[PDB]
């Protein structure tokens, strides 16, 4: 099926508490494979998946140099953004950047992205055509003017249509056992009374990969979205994920409720019933 590579960068200013913290992480689909942390002693880009350890010294030396270059730009950015928004030095602020590429079933470029946030809000984003920018506010328009004059989008477009897809294809080959796999969810429902007249029905999905999944409750075939508690999909720690959805129902109506599970490892969507 389709695949993607994504790098995530977080920089946090910490006034008077040292230089800003910088953390970079890389993923292929839902599997992490590299990290850089500005506060660790190594000061190197580091492997976080066994299938990336085979890369040579040129790889790790080059990845380390380029990610420190990312770090320095974000250090400059934190000062630049303070001036744009007329903010004092005392406060801590957050810059986030995410970029990467998707490939299709033919393993060729589908689309790419490069997005930037300041203090948890969209700041500037490369549009899907990879030629224009979506700027969230007046300060971001200043950045857009500067990036248009320096032709920033063309350079990112080249990386996203070239380097990005060619290394994703390499990682997909080197990590075939981890990345080219699908683990279907192991499903069940639990039942527990909360009083004499109500019960909690909880629909479980366990040990699945990749993370994308849909869990839905139906009462007599009607979706119960407004009355469902749906937790965020969570890692088990072993490279698989878990999720559940729960409803509280009147005791005796259990047979009205069904849970519906959709996941790409299931040949057909599952319905779980209480009878």
């Amino acid at each position: 099926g389709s695949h993607s590579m994504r790098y995530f960068f977080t920089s946090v200013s910490r006034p008077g508490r040292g230089e800003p913290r910088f953390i970079a992480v890389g993923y292929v689909d839902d599997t992490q494979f590299v990290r850089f942390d500005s506060d660790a002693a190594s000061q190197r880009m580091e492997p976080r998946a066994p299938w990336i350890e085979q890369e040579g010294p040129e790889y790790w030396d080059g990845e380390t140099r380029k990610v420190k270059a990312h770090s320095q730009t974000h250090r400059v950015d934190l000062g630049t953004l303070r001036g744009y928004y007329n903010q004092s030095e005392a406060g801590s602020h957050t810059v986030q950047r995410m970029y990467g590429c998707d490939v299709g079933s033919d393993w060729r470029f589908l689309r790419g992205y490069h997005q930037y946030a300041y203090d948890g809000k969209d700041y500037i984003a490369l549009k899907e055509d990879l030629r224009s920018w979506t700027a969230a506010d007046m300060a971001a328009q200043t950045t857009k003017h500067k990036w248009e004059a320096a032709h920033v989008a063309e350079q990112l477009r080249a990386y996203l249509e070239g380097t990005c897809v060619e290394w994703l294809r390499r990682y997909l080959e080197n990590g075939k056992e981890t990345l080219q796999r699908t683990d279907a969810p192991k499903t069940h429902m639990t039942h527990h009374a909360v009083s004499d007249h109500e019960a909690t029905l909880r629909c479980w999905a366990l040990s699945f990969y990749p993370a994308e999944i849909t869990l839905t409750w139906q009462r007599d075939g009607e979706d119960q979205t407004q009355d469902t508690e749906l937790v965020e999909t969570r890692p088990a720690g072993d490279g698989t994920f878990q999720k559940w959805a729960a409803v509280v129902v009147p005791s005796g109506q259990e047979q009205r409720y069904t849970c519906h599970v959709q996941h790409e490892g299931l040949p057909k969507p599952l319905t779980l019933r209480w009878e």
């Binding site: 890389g26 380029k66 270059a69 950015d77 970029y99 920033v152």
Partner: peptide, 9 residues
């Protein structure tokens, strides 16, 4: 592999 260079805002 990461991009070679990013540009300041």
């Amino acid at each position: 592999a990461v991009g070679s260079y990013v540009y300041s805002v």
